[PDB]
DNA sequence: TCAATATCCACCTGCAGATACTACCAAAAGTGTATTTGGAAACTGCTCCATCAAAAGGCATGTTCAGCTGGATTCCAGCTGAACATGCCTTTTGATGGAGCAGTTTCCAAATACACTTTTGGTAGTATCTGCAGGTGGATATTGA
DNA sequence: TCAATATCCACCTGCAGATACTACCAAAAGTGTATTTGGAAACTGCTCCATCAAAAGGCATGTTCAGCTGGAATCCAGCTGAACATGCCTTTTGATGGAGCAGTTTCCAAATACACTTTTGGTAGTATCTGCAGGTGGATATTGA
């Protein structure tokens, strides 16, 4: 009945730091982190489509929201990653 | 048969993100590539923070991450602190700073 | 009482964690007042969120939503 | 000395500094003034959340305010410093 | 093609201050004022229904949002006015 | 037979309904929400306009301008709290000098 | 000329006086210019994003208003 | 006298920075984000930006002169502008 | 400079709580397939309102001075911290019932669709009329004495 | 206190830029009537966890003293504001484009529904292992000498 992001956080952790664990209090913080950024990005993407009279949210709205929210080099790398993901999703 | 996270090359879920976007009253329609982009972004940010936190844990000679380490990571970084400046980490403490 | 249970040593510890070397004797009442002000604002918003739903128990999510309103997002409980 | 050892010890830690029963008692007393005179129950994680938030608020305020003692050439914390910090923050 | 709240602002003004006019720059400020409060109240009402797993926005959500946003005596009077409006709307 | 008349209002109930429906706030919208919200908006509008007209009268004028709105807002304890993160074009500041 | 030395001493003195300031140090005129440049960079960066999204080459007032509203600053008199 | 100028400038509402310098600066900043393209600017957009900037600066000066007096001074220093920004966030 | 006392720092031991792992399962959530539909891209085109130059006069620039303020020094009394001996209030633990949460009915309220009437936004061409600028007359505070 | 000079208020006149008032219109939108549907309220029951008690001892409280610091008074030199003469940059105006905004078409990507795998969350049960506390044991600065 309850759902979370813990599985995927654990995978990513074993992918960057294979020797390192994580406590239960900390994964709550990480789950809260993921829920917050989702809400922010989707909220900005909702408005851009309303401002421009669009009824559909696409990857362009998410990209623009990423540019607006995230600071500096972090936005640059996030844009690169998302673009690659879409690129190799389409080519399958 | 095949998932969409695998086509995209990701660990995060692309179906769940789609579901949450549709059920959140964000817009009438939702495209195919939006969940992929968003999941990739979330994965990138998680990995960044976890890397920094594991480094902080190792410096303190520990094998396990706790909120103290995430706080140190976040406040020692000039960008994550700006993204998370209105945020308080439970059981995280403060940075040592005298004067 | 009930505001005098926030003791002189507790306030002194909170000050030291903030890097304070010396502390006037009038800081103990001022801190008590500002704390009492902070709790009132959060608690009424929590109680409002709690009454909209028709229940008589304050949950952690009500507190989290209240703080999020005040602009004080909290990680750890939801 | 003694102040420097204590400062170093306390910045290195994470635990809560106010005792729990007094904070609980005060929060309940404040709640009862709303609610139209009836006593609500509280989950425990709720009181811990509120306590964490409050102590964070106070520590950060003390930090912001000891910057105004040194601005004025002092070492001792006074109440005018806290008042002015709250004013400038916008609270 | 463009729409605004100027008509109703002018009516209310002639209802409180019959001798007094209003300039065009000021009515822009008032129109901006009305659009802002609408967005805030409706945004809070959207979340309360999501938090509690409801698919409908009612007068109770608006009332709670009013209590949360507005400070003190102003919320009290706003609640009174809205309640009267609904009461005499239903009785017709 | 209009909805604003049935309710005793000057503000538009139908328009508020349409704007709630089109804004992606929820999948459904009830019938009392537009009237309740329109009434709240009318109350606040009139509350501001009263003080602005009073300020104009004090300045010996018959027409409201943004300066008057600013004075009204900043001299009232609650409206300032509501509108404290807002700047009003062509409004200026409140006079304030202080001794050292 | 550097396009920020067009923000002159008298203008800064006037803003300070409207703020209630009696005396001003000679080092305030360069500090203010940096503050202003930072503010403008932050607002304009977001304004340009909103209009490039819409596939325009013209910055409107709504783009500026949206940017400010993001930054935590809400401006009424425009539309 | 400083006292007459303060009183006069607090009754007024007009803008204090001249238009063309502000426009030039704002267009100089824009071209760095547009990758060489000279974007056009509505006339009602530059006025918006100017109103906002002047408000920001006036309120900052107020907050800082609050800190000059705290220190026992009458003269405004950069020392005092920097600290107000830190405390505001 | 000397140094015992804290004090720091490291190192080793034991164990208790909390982590990680395996198996079951089942349900609910995501994937694949085919159909239909509607939003948005692509291409035209027209009128608005943005940009580019020019002419001049009003605000800014530069120099000097003198009066005011910032900053360092000295002195003294108030007030904070540290230490020590009491004891009172917090913490931990355990039986108990009240309230949250899930499941079932149903019924009242909202969405969908068509016709018809009302309202609001924009333009043309007015006509006031309110507020600002300049002009003049009467009256006081502060500059210096 | 004297007093002229700005300066302060007040009144007046003139005018012109902006607000109210009509017409009109016609396009968009809101209202009224039936019909169907499903979301949420009302009722019942259950079990989880939150209130409420009673012991133990560890942190808080009170008194006193010594020394550190805040605050007031001098004094000196740096530096900011005010005034005046001058000239350069901003403001205003008129003329073209070019880009925004409205219109038409169509096609591609989204919703919709149904059947089929799969993955994730929860529950026993296992065990294991990381780190915290304790204590030994080596070795450094420190404020009183």
Numbering used by the authors:
A (entry chain D), E (entry chain H): 33 to 124
B (entry chain C): 14 to 112
C (entry chain F): 24 to 101
D (entry chain E): 45 to 135
F (entry chain G): 15 to 114
G (entry chain B): 23 to 101
H (entry chain A): 46 to 134
Show the paper's wording.
The histone variant CENP-A is the epigenetic determinant for the centromere, where it is interspersed with canonical H3 to form a specialized chromatin structure that nucleates the kinetochore. As one of two pillars for kinetochore assembly at the centromere, CENP-N recognizes the CENP-A nucleosome through its amino-terminal region, while forming a heterodimer with CENP-L through its carboxy-terminal region to recruit other CCAN proteins. Here we demonstrate that the human CENP-A-interacting protein CENP-N promotes the stacking of CENP-A-containing mononucleosomes and nucleosomal arrays through a previously undefined interaction between the α6 helix of CENP-N with the DNA of a neighboring nucleosome. Overall, our data suggest that CENP-N, as one of the key proteins of the inner kinetochore, stabilizes, organizes, and compacts centromeric chromatin in a way that depends on its specific interaction with CENP-A nucleosomes and on its DNA-directed interactions with a neighboring nucleosome.
In the cryo-EM images, we consistently observed that ~30% of CENP-A nucleosomes form ordered stacks on the grid in the presence of CENP-N, ranging from 2–10 nucleosomes. By focusing single-particle analysis on nucleosome pairs contained in these stacks, defined density for CENP-N was observed between two nucleosomes in the two-dimensional (2D) class averages for nucleosomes reconstituted on either DNA fragment. After three-dimensional (3D) reconstruction and refinement, we obtained cryo-EM maps in which one or two CENP-N1–289 could be unambiguously docked between two CENP-A nucleosomes. a, A model of two CENP-A nucleosomes (α satellite DNA) connected by two copies of CENP-N was fit into the density map. Superposition of 3D maps showed the exact same nucleosome stacks in cryo-EM datasets of CENP-N with CENP-A nucleosomes reconstituted onto the two DNA sequences, suggesting that the DNA-sequence context does not affect nucleosome stacking. Our structures reveal a previously unidentified interface between CENP-N and nucleosomal DNA, consisting of a series of positively charged amino acids (K102, K105, K109, K110, R114, and K117) that are all located on the same face of the α6 helix of CENP-N, on the opposite side of the main CENP-A decoding interface on CENP-N. These side chains allow α6 to dock onto super helical location (SHL) 4–5 of the second nucleosome in the stack. Neither of these side chains is in the interface involved in specific recognition of CENP-A, and as expected, a gel shift assay showed no difference in binding to CENP-A mono-nucleosomes made with CENP-N containing the K102A mutation. This is consistent with our MD simulations, which demonstrate that the α6 helix (in particular the amino acids listed above) form strong contacts with the neighboring DNA.
